[PDB]
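Chain and backbone:
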Amino acid sequence: EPKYQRILIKLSGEALAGEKGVGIDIPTVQAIAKEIAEVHVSGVQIALVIGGGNLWRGEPAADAGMDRVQADYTGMLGTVMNALVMADSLQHYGVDTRVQTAIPMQNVAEPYIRGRALRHLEKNRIVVFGAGIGSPYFSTDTTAALRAAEIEADAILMAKNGVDGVYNADPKKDANAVKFDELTHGEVIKRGLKIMDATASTLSMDNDIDLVVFNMNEAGNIQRVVFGEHIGTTVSNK
């Protein structure tokens, strides 16, 4: 009895880089895919949104003086590379997956169409979104929020690769910082916690999509989140 029937897991590119912090370490990807595969057995519909930090960061691009628009597209491509590897790893554990890219690439991967995406999930397949939303200037949060709203997901599990929730103070400085267990979209604003981008936050709230921040590096942790086990920080409209 999962608390959520359809979730959208957001992963950072780094989470797939492994030791180094850059590139894609397949054995690491399979480790994450094996865990998602296990949760998928519960019957919960799943969709993924991966970042591309492990392959490209905009910061040095801007410092180098590269065109912002072109730089953003470059990153989106990196997103599809993580998707293809994540999709393959998932198939390794008998999961029927489908990659949908915001930027249509006829041959390489199926283009994004809400209609299809919805039907795919209804067939118990995992959908992996790539290229964010095909448009520059937006963030990965916006991508997770927008996509979650379109496929009508109950919650967005922000599987952090380290952090285990949202603290009342910077857990890196305040040795006595405590993590909130349950917050409301508005309350998060009334404290300027800024868990997600300003745009993404509005989307999540308006469409009543829960936000869960938790540490995914813990074995079977994500599964617990799906089943209600209070492990991280849940943001919702109570």
